[PDB]
Design an enzyme around this catalytic site. Sequence first.
Site, short mmCIF file in Angstrom:
data_model
loop_
_atom_site.label_atom_id
_atom_site.label_comp_id
_atom_site.label_asym_id
_atom_site.label_seq_id
_atom_site.Cartn_x
_atom_site.Cartn_y
_atom_site.Cartn_z
N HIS A 1 -3.94 9.08 15.35
CA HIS A 1 -3.93 9.11 13.90
C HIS A 1 -3.15 10.23 13.23
CE1 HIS A 1 -6.47 5.63 13.57
NE2 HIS A 1 -7.35 6.16 14.40
N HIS B 1 -13.13 9.72 13.88
CA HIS B 1 -12.81 8.34 13.49
C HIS B 1 -12.08 8.28 12.14
CE1 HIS B 1 -14.80 6.25 16.72
NE2 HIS B 1 -15.89 6.98 16.54
N1 LIG Z 1 -9.10 -3.30 9.20
C1 LIG Z 1 -8.06 -3.47 8.28
C2 LIG Z 1 -6.75 -3.12 8.63
C3 LIG Z 1 -5.72 -3.30 7.72
N2 LIG Z 1 -5.98 -3.86 6.32
C4 LIG Z 1 -4.92 -4.08 5.29
O1 LIG Z 1 -3.98 -5.02 5.78
C5 LIG Z 1 -2.62 -4.61 5.41
C6 LIG Z 1 -1.61 -5.04 6.47
O2 LIG Z 1 -1.60 -6.50 6.62
C7 LIG Z 1 -2.68 -3.10 5.21
O3 LIG Z 1 -1.78 -2.72 4.15
C8 LIG Z 1 -4.17 -2.79 4.92
O4 LIG Z 1 -4.59 -2.23 3.71
P1 LIG Z 1 -4.95 -0.66 3.70
O5 LIG Z 1 -5.20 -0.20 2.28
O6 LIG Z 1 -3.85 0.03 4.50
O7 LIG Z 1 -6.28 -0.45 4.57
C9 LIG Z 1 -7.55 -0.96 4.11
C10 LIG Z 1 -8.66 -0.58 5.06
O8 LIG Z 1 -8.27 -0.89 6.43
C11 LIG Z 1 -8.87 0.07 7.31
N3 LIG Z 1 -7.85 0.70 8.18
C12 LIG Z 1 -6.49 0.90 7.94
N4 LIG Z 1 -5.87 1.50 8.93
C13 LIG Z 1 -6.87 1.73 9.87
C14 LIG Z 1 -6.79 2.35 11.13
O9 LIG Z 1 -5.80 2.83 11.65
N5 LIG Z 1 -8.04 2.39 11.80
C15 LIG Z 1 -9.31 1.82 11.23
N6 LIG Z 1 -10.43 1.90 11.97
N7 LIG Z 1 -9.34 1.25 10.04
C16 LIG Z 1 -8.10 1.23 9.42
C17 LIG Z 1 -9.66 1.05 6.43
O10 LIG Z 1 -11.03 0.65 6.40
C18 LIG Z 1 -8.93 0.91 5.11
O11 LIG Z 1 -9.68 1.37 4.00
C19 LIG Z 1 -7.39 -4.21 6.03
O12 LIG Z 1 -7.74 -4.67 4.95
N8 LIG Z 1 -8.39 -3.97 7.10
#
Ligand SMILES: Nc1ccn([C@@H]2O[C@H](CO)[C@@H](O)[C@H]2OP(=O)(O)OC[C@H]2O[C@@H](n3cnc4c(=O)[nH]c(N)nc43)[C@H](O)[C@@H]2O)c(=O)n1
Length: 105
Positions: free
Chosen positions: A10, A97
């Site tokens: 990360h 995390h």
């Molecule tokens: N689990 C996820 C991962 C990506 N996305 C979204 O899908 C898009 C790509 O198709 C991204 O621009 C994301 O929006 P976002 O604002 O970047 O993220 C939204 C949420 O996703 C989770 N997330 C993003 N990156 C990470 C990561 O590296 N790890 C984890 N555990 N969660 C992540 C968080 O909970 C975050 O608040 C999502 O809704 N949920």
Amino acid sequence: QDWDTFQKKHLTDTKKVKCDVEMKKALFDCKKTNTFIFARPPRVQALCKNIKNNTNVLSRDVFYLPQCNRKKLPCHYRLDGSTNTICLTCMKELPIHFAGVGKCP
Ligand SMILES: Nc1ccn([C@@H]2O[C@H](CO)[C@@H](O)[C@H]2OP(=O)(O)OC[C@H]2O[C@@H](n3cnc4c(=O)[nH]c(N)nc43)[C@H](O)[C@@H]2O)c(=O)n1
């Protein structure tokens, strides 16, 4: 799961992450998405000072977030980026995390 693993997947030293190169590593195993934080360990670690174990913390300051999103199977990515606050899960005052972006769950 731990401070060491949190840093490896990360934290980043560059804004232009080589997604296709990084994501193929066993740590990521070509998962759908992984958000990186452009910062040094010290700055990130400090966010967990005086935080109750196993609880999340929402930063007040912003960070640039290089993000790798999978576009083609099995392991081809597009690099995206944005700026926002980060939610981290703390344990013994050490981030373990990546909880959320913009806010905590
Ligand atoms: N689990 C996820 C991962 C990506 N996305 C979204 O899908 C898009 C790509 O198709 C991204 O621009 C994301 O929006 P976002 O604002 O970047 O993220 C939204 C949420 O996703 C989770 N997330 C993003 N990156 C990470 C990561 O590296 N790890 C984890 N555990 N969660 C992540 C968080 O909970 C975050 O608040 C999502 O809704 N949920």
